[PDB]
Design a protein around this ligand. Structure first.
Ligand SMILES: CN1CCN(C(=O)Nc2ccccc2)CC1
Length: 171
């Protein structure tokens, strides 16, 4: 059985208990914490691409009102985010299993852009999700996995100073 684990869940959970926030910029901002995934049970000899996307966790716009995040009352459907390909892709199972797969190079933006960067809607809540895609073989296969511990709200600047403090303390 293919196993997918979050690395450093300890720390992600401290961010989640405060409501996590991730900065988006026109040019694209790298994430902290970085999503790092432990994977076992791949065929060491099979070929795989690791993909990262962001599900809109709800259909609402969120606002930081008197020190607390609160959803709006006017939900709109949220079209899916674009996919980020891990730059080690495509690669052997052995490659992916020798150390945590670290998405250190994904950039989050609020503006449609050349590419690389992934465009999110500011003040929406997102749940990171990976796809593990077996490629090159006869049988294509996809395994997907969400990471609720890594949920955040996309912001153009931090609202909760307790997040600001944690971001610096641990970087
Ligand atoms: C620079 N990039 C990195 C490697 N890459 C892919 O892995 N694409 C792909 C193709 C089919 C299924 C999943 C991913 C495209 C080029």
């Amino acid at each position: 059985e293919l196993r997918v684990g979050l690395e450093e869940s300890e720390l992600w959970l401290r961010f989640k208990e405060l409501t996590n926030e991730m900065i988006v910029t026109k040019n694209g901002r790298r994430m902290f914490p970085v999503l790092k995934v432990n994977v076992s049970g791949l065929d060491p000899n099979a070929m795989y691409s690791f993909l990262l996307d962001f599900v809109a966790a709800d259909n609402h716009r969120w606002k930081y009102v008197n020190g607390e995040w609160v959803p709006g009352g006017k939900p709109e459907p949220q079209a899916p985010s674009c996919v980020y390909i891990h730059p080690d892709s495509p690669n052997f199972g052995a490659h992916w299993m020798k150390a945590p797969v670290s998405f250190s190079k994904v950039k989050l933006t609020n503006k449609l852009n050349g590419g690389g960067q992934i465009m999110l809607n500011s003040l929406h809540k997102y749940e990171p999700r990976i796809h593990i895609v077996r490629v090159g073989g006869p049988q294509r296969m996809i395994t997907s996995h969400c990471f609720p511990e890594t949920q955040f709200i996309a912001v153009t600047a931090y609202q909760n100073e307790e997040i600001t403090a944690l971001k610096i303390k641990y970087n």
